[PDB]
Write an enzyme that holds these catalytic residues in place. Structure first.
Site, PDB file in Angstrom:
ATOM      1  N   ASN A 125      -6.059 -20.166  -6.167  1.00 26.34           N
ATOM      2  CA  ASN A 125      -6.163 -21.396  -5.368  1.00 26.34           C
ATOM      3  C   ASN A 125      -4.805 -21.835  -4.838  1.00 26.34           C
ATOM      4  O   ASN A 125      -4.722 -22.483  -3.786  1.00 26.34           O
ATOM      5  CB  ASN A 125      -6.677 -22.532  -6.270  1.00 26.34           C
ATOM      6  CG  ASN A 125      -6.582 -23.930  -5.631  1.00 26.34           C
ATOM      7  OD1 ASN A 125      -7.272 -24.219  -4.653  1.00 26.34           O
ATOM      8  ND2 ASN A 125      -5.729 -24.793  -6.193  1.00 26.34           N
TER       9      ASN A 125
ATOM     10  N   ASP B 294      -1.119 -25.468  -2.034  1.00 29.96           N
ATOM     11  CA  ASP B 294      -2.519 -25.041  -1.926  1.00 29.96           C
ATOM     12  C   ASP B 294      -2.771 -23.990  -0.847  1.00 29.96           C
ATOM     13  O   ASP B 294      -2.548 -24.262   0.328  1.00 29.96           O
ATOM     14  CB  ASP B 294      -3.345 -26.295  -1.653  1.00 29.96           C
ATOM     15  CG  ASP B 294      -4.801 -26.170  -2.069  1.00 29.96           C
ATOM     16  OD1 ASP B 294      -5.062 -25.910  -3.261  1.00 29.96           O
ATOM     17  OD2 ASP B 294      -5.695 -26.378  -1.217  1.00 29.96           O
TER      18      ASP B 294
ATOM     19  N   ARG C 183     -11.893 -14.382 -14.221  1.00 29.85           N
ATOM     20  CA  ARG C 183     -12.094 -15.812 -14.367  1.00 29.85           C
ATOM     21  C   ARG C 183     -11.456 -16.385 -13.092  1.00 29.85           C
ATOM     22  O   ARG C 183     -10.282 -16.075 -12.814  1.00 29.85           O
ATOM     23  CB  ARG C 183     -11.294 -16.358 -15.527  1.00 29.85           C
ATOM     24  CG  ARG C 183     -11.276 -17.883 -15.647  1.00 29.85           C
ATOM     25  CD  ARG C 183     -10.202 -18.283 -16.600  1.00 29.85           C
ATOM     26  NE  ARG C 183     -10.153 -19.721 -16.767  1.00 29.85           N
ATOM     27  CZ  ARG C 183      -9.248 -20.512 -16.212  1.00 29.85           C
ATOM     28  NH1 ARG C 183      -8.296 -20.021 -15.436  1.00 29.85           N
ATOM     29  NH2 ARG C 183      -9.287 -21.808 -16.459  1.00 29.85           N
TER      30      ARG C 183
ATOM     31  N   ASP D  78      -9.718 -19.102 -11.620  1.00 36.72           N
ATOM     32  CA  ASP D  78      -9.028 -20.357 -11.955  1.00 36.72           C
ATOM     33  C   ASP D  78      -9.197 -21.467 -10.912  1.00 36.72           C
ATOM     34  O   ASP D  78      -9.241 -21.165  -9.717  1.00 36.72           O
ATOM     35  CB  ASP D  78      -7.539 -20.044 -12.075  1.00 36.72           C
ATOM     36  CG  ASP D  78      -6.679 -21.264 -12.364  1.00 36.72           C
ATOM     37  OD1 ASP D  78      -6.842 -21.823 -13.458  1.00 36.72           O
ATOM     38  OD2 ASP D  78      -5.855 -21.663 -11.508  1.00 36.72           O
TER      39      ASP D  78
ATOM     40  N   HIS E  92     -11.384 -26.499  -7.090  1.00 31.49           N
ATOM     41  CA  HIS E  92     -10.443 -26.826  -6.024  1.00 31.49           C
ATOM     42  C   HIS E  92     -10.514 -25.885  -4.813  1.00 31.49           C
ATOM     43  O   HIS E  92      -9.609 -25.899  -3.948  1.00 31.49           O
ATOM     44  CB  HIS E  92      -9.051 -26.857  -6.624  1.00 31.49           C
ATOM     45  CG  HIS E  92      -8.917 -27.890  -7.697  1.00 31.49           C
ATOM     46  ND1 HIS E  92      -8.736 -29.224  -7.406  1.00 31.49           N
ATOM     47  CD2 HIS E  92      -9.100 -27.818  -9.037  1.00 31.49           C
ATOM     48  CE1 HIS E  92      -8.826 -29.930  -8.520  1.00 31.49           C
ATOM     49  NE2 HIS E  92      -9.047 -29.101  -9.522  1.00 31.49           N
TER      50      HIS E  92
ATOM     51  N   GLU F 203     -14.115 -21.356 -12.783  1.00 28.80           N
ATOM     52  CA  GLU F 203     -13.746 -22.546 -13.582  1.00 28.80           C
ATOM     53  C   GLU F 203     -13.969 -23.861 -12.804  1.00 28.80           C
ATOM     54  O   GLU F 203     -13.222 -24.186 -11.872  1.00 28.80           O
ATOM     55  CB  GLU F 203     -12.283 -22.471 -14.003  1.00 28.80           C
ATOM     56  CG  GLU F 203     -11.856 -23.571 -14.974  1.00 28.80           C
ATOM     57  CD  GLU F 203     -10.460 -24.152 -14.722  1.00 28.80           C
ATOM     58  OE1 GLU F 203      -9.884 -24.689 -15.693  1.00 28.80           O
ATOM     59  OE2 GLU F 203      -9.941 -24.112 -13.587  1.00 28.80           O
TER      60      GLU F 203
ATOM     61  N   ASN G 224     -13.550 -26.829 -25.405  1.00 25.00           N
ATOM     62  CA  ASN G 224     -13.726 -27.648 -24.182  1.00 25.00           C
ATOM     63  C   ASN G 224     -12.470 -27.791 -23.336  1.00 25.00           C
ATOM     64  O   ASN G 224     -12.537 -27.782 -22.108  1.00 25.00           O
ATOM     65  CB  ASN G 224     -14.232 -29.027 -24.562  1.00 25.00           C
ATOM     66  CG  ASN G 224     -13.941 -29.386 -26.027  1.00 25.00           C
ATOM     67  OD1 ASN G 224     -12.848 -29.126 -26.536  1.00 25.00           O
ATOM     68  ND2 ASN G 224     -14.928 -29.951 -26.711  1.00 25.00           N
TER      69      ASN G 224
HETATM   70 CA   LIG Z   1      -7.515 -25.709  -2.782  1.00 26.06          CA
HETATM   71 CL   LIG Z   2     -12.210 -21.552 -17.863  1.00 25.60          CL
END
Ligand SMILES: [Ca+2]
Ligand SMILES: [Cl-]
Ligand SMILES: CCOC(=O)/C=C/c1ccc(O)c(O)c1
Ligand SMILES: CCOC(=O)/C=C/c1ccc(O)c(O)c1
Ligand SMILES: CCOC(=O)/C=C/c1ccc(O)c(O)c1
Ligand SMILES: *[C@@H]1O[C@H](CO)[C@@H](O)[C@H](O)[C@H]1NC(C)=O
Length: 496
Positions: free
Chosen positions: A100, A167, A195, A197, A201, A233, A298
């Site tokens: 991201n 970003d 995964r 990340d 976003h 995620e 968590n």
């Molecule tokens: Ca973004």
């Molecule tokens: Cl995660």
């Protein structure tokens, strides 16, 4: 993107947080394959920032400088050696893909990079990729700071800077292609998935356009046509406009309400109790099981950078942690992930805890080796929760009962519960403040079975509690609330 690509019968993955590639390769051979673990989620393998202090905080690995595979966990030769050795013993590798963003828009307060690549956050110059100012969202974000100001606002969440991190403009096909080039190099080495990340976003369509460029898996180890496992995620707690259902077309999604609610229930928050877990899963409003990636930490490494549900655990808390992991691994909902952590001091203030500049054990910048003690636990400050007998044996329980239905639920209206997994497993928990002693119906056949929480099945006999099942599948279970692990688990392979 929804199937884990693990070997048939291996049903969980372990996150070996910040471990070196050599230590993961050895772990695959000496422990993960013999114990049936499905795979390992590794920390980000791409080059990242190195703050000038030493101070090697864990968050440095979430600030990319390039896509070279060169970090404190090792270089590219060490990474390929690990993927090759782990896949050769059937243990898959899943990479934490930080796509991201690049590093902090400042960060030049004093910093270098892990493989020496040049970078300059201020001019948005990342020549080792190469990315320039035209590849970031500084002109698409409409906040006055350029950072996310409201974390429930859908457009700022996706187009602005997460905590100042530059970003990426994922709507540009050049940016999507550089990311796919990095991810495809990893799939071609032998990685089984990723995964993703900070998926909350990113826009669902931009993630899909990146995933549509991904390769089928390496067919020297995976059947032809296999696709990379993807778990996104996304923290979705409830009423916000971004929802996990915006991402089901791209792969699985992390269900953060799973670990948050299992943590509040086992801690009895607000009068919650384990008997409420009778309809755990979609009955609790969680995402569909075939799109869920579940876990109980968590929010691990609960530092100041985090907007969600959280619960880290110590001694009386290790007891609750093992209970939470055992319930998760016996329950059929979702694909399970266990976390293996490192040891770090806490401060005891702000309400709960605040020693937050944590980073892994390091040998002057490079991660320290994982050492194994004579009782199979780890040293060198690695906790190795996956080697704890109660957790490892529940990873095996999940494999043994693979595909069997949830059945035979029992509860006492408070915190003593139990359930079966068809005719191949049964588990009982006692989280009330009194002992449990009752005969329950299992779906298991007559025989003597070893409890795999208090012991092991070694050489035709058990090392801990034995449970006797009668001809009509009934069995007596006695659990003291003062036991270190107030739960018992038995399955078809722990039968004598
Ligand atoms: Ca973004
Ligand atoms: Cl995660
Ligand atoms: C005693 C452990 O030794 C190893 O695990 C060897 C790891 C290794 C990694 C990369 C290489 O190119 C290699 O030759 C070896
Ligand atoms: C049986 C279908 O159930 C669902 O599709 C659940 C969708 C869902 C979406 C976002 C969430 O945060 C969630 O908990 C659930
Ligand atoms: C008596 C315990 O010995 C060890 O724990 C050896 C750990 C180890 C050995 C070789 C390696 O290359 C490594 O990364 C770790
Ligand atoms: C192992 O020990 C249990 C008692 O703890 C006994 O019931 C069982 O029959 C023993 N195993 C064999 C193979 O005799």
């Amino acid at each position: 993107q929804y199937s884990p690509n693990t070997q048939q019968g291996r049903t969980s993955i372990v996150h070996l947080f910040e471990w070196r590639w050599v230590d993961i390769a050895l772990e695959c051979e000496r422990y993960l394959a013999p114990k049936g673990f499905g795979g390992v989620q590794v920390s980000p393998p791409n080059e990242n920032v190195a703050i000038y202090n030493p101070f090697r905080p864990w968050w440095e690995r979430y600030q990319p400088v390039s896509y070279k595979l060169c970090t404190r966990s090792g270089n590219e030769d060490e990474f390929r050696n690990m993927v090759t050795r782990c896949n050769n013993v059937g243990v898959r590798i899943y990479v934490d893909a930080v796509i991201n963003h690049m590093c902090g828009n400042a960060v030049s307060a004093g910093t270098s990079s892990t493989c020496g690549s040049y970078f300059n956050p201020g001019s948005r110059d990342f020549p080792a990729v190469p990315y320039s100012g035209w590849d970031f969202n500084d002109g698409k974000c409409k906040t006055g700071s350029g950072d996310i100001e409201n974390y429930n606002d859908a457009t700022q969440v996706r187009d602005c800077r997460l905590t100042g991190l530059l970003d990426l403009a994922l709507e540009k096909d050049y940016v999507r292609s550089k990311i796919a080039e990095y991810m495809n190099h990893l799939i071609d080495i032998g990685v089984a998935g990723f995964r993703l990340d900070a998926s909350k976003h990113m826009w669902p369509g931009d993630i899909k356009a990146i995933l549509d460029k991904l390769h089928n898996l390496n067919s020297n180890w995976f059947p032809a046509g296999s696709k990379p496992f993807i778990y996104q995620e996304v923290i979705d707690l409830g009423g916000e406009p971004i929802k996990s259902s915006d991402y089901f077309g791209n792969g699985r999604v992390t269900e953060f309400k799973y670990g948050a609610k299992l943590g509040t229930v086992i801690r009895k928050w607000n009068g919650e109790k384990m008997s409420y877990l009778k309809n755990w899963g979609e009955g609790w409003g969680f995402v569909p099981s075939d799109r869920a990636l579940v876990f109980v930490d968590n929010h691990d490494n609960q530092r100041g950078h985090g907007a969600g549900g959280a619960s880290i655990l110590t001694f009386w808390d290790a007891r609750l942690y093992k209970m939470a992991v055992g319930f998760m691994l016996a329950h059929p909902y979702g694909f399970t992930r266990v976390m293996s952590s490192y040891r770090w001091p806490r401060q005891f203030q702000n309400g709960n805890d605040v020693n937050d500049w944590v980073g892994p054990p390091n040998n002057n910048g490079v991660i320290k080796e994982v050492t194994i003690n004579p009782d199979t636990t780890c040293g060198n400050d690695w906790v190795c929760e996956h080697r704890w007998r109660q957790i490892r044996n529940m990873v095996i329980f999940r494999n043994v009962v693979d595909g069997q239905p949830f059945t035979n639920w029992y509860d006492n209206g408070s915190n003593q519960v139990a359930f079966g997994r068809g005719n191949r497993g049964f588990i009982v928990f006692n989280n009330d403040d009194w002992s449990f002693s009752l005969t329950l119906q299992t779906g298991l056949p007559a025989g003597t079975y070893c409890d795999v929480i208090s012991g092991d099945k070694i050489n035709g006999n058990c090392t801990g509690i034995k449970i006797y099942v009668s001809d009509d599948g009934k069995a007596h279970f006695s659990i003291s609330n003062s036991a270190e692990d107030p739960f018992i688990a038995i399955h078809a392979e722990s039968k004598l």
